[model samples]
Target chain A: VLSPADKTNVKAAWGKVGAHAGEYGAEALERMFLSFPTTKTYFPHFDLSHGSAQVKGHGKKVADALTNAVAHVDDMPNALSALSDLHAHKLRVDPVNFKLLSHCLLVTLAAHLPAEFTPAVHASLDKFLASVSTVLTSKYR
Target chain B: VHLTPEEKSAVTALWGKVNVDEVGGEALGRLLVVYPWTQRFFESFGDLSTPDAVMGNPKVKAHGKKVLGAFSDGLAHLDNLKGTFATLSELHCDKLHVDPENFRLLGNVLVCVLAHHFGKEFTPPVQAAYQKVVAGVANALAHKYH
Candidate 1:
């Protein structure tokens, strides 16, 4: 449940993040894998080495999903319904991984964009990530 | 995850009085009821269609006992949590495929359970100590991902 101010902060933050979404996304995934090795089970098909291209490719996909969610911030469930189905039904990704990834993404953003990742924006992005995770994992029910 | 001797003693003293079976059952029943989506992992338990059904189910009670028992294990090994929870972490992340976030959720639920049963005796300092205990437990349980 984002307040009006939260939405504004998220939109503004994304404006900065959108341009290097792929790079940030890649670093985020790498951070998750390095910090939380069990997350790698989900990507057993890909080589999860340092600077793996597959990670970059998949990272861009994740960034794209967030970008799409940013475009339709108010209606996230509908925006990501298809992806929700794929992960819930096909990928069988435990909903817990979303938070793990969310935390890593936050670290990545904070590392690269510390100036913009202020406390207010941090709270806003945290809420936005939770919202996105909720939407992505809704079908698990 | 470093708990001082005082904090460790506080956690141990509080844990000593807890009726493991009852408190554990209460925490888990409440978890399933409050976070209905978590039922995805307990589908095999059957008849979780309503709160009453989930609360009264024997399987839920049994599993809750095990879950709380794991916390007890963590409590006993405060100095070596990661090693203590290593196998449990593997089972959870590798076999059970539990969402790591649920550990945090259940940790909070257990604290509320303690607060409920202990009432005024559950003082802020005690809770602060217990919070660190459970946070350590949750981190240990979720460390396989890290």
Candidate 2:
């Protein structure tokens, strides 16, 4: 449901985020683990203890996927369907987890783009992320 | 395999620009066309000459990203390389019937493609580091074949 103007603003702001994508990813992932310690059980392979490579790299991975999502926000359906199957059918990640990441992403974006950040941009991103979680978890239904 | 801390950062830094799914799909296609024998594993990826079409296929793209993701995972867990490598090693050899012998050549091809992908950042030190890592992967893949 992103209008052309909304898409343009988010994409321009995301361009800055894309530059430090790995950093933002790491920060948001760390935030997620800290806020939702119960969700840490899914990744048995990762250490996930504080200040571990497991945490940082997993953060990079989440942010990297977010970057891919940003690049394809114009084609939201196709962009997210693959993620849907993998997350819902295969990995069985809780759909509510997407909101957890959304909060973290907004915080990351806000930290990275203080000058460009605005309430309107934040609102657009919230909707954008909702659609992302919606389309990604569509297969579950 | 003991990787210097700098070597690990050098690699992690290299991947932020990789677009692994996109680049990896093309690389796998190029591997099929230029090398041909690898075609056995990728017959479903469409005609080798039309690399772009091959890349566009969803399954192939996901598979490419999967391998690329494995490399990132490898870099992430170098300290635990033996553990990770052993798990994937069994998958490739026992479950998938993927020829472990193939990884050596595949490793060579990946190094070439990565050298091209990384360009200026693929410095002599970086080049040596990646070469060593690929060699280690090749060695690990071959270990459980017996």
Q: Among these predicted structures, which one has the highest lDDT?
A: 1
Docking category of candidate 1? incorrect
Candidate by candidate, in order, the iRMS in Å equals 4.2, 16.1
TM values, all candidates: 0.62, 0.47
- Native A-B interface contacts kept, per candidate: 0.20, 0.00
Off by over 4 Å in 1: A1-141, B1-6
lDDT of 2 by residue, A21-93 (tens): 7777778777776765434645667847677788677677766676677788877678767877887665656
- lDDT, candidate 1, B21-120, per-residue tens: 8888889889888776667677799988788998899999998899899888887787889889998998988776576888889999999999999999
Best by TM-score: 1
Cα lDDT for residue B55, candidate 1: 88
lDDT of 2 by residue, B25-103 (tens): 5556556545544554566756654556655667666777777677777677766666677878777655554545567
Question: lDDT at B131 for candidate 1?
Answer: 90
* B-chain TM-score for every candidate: 0.94, 0.81
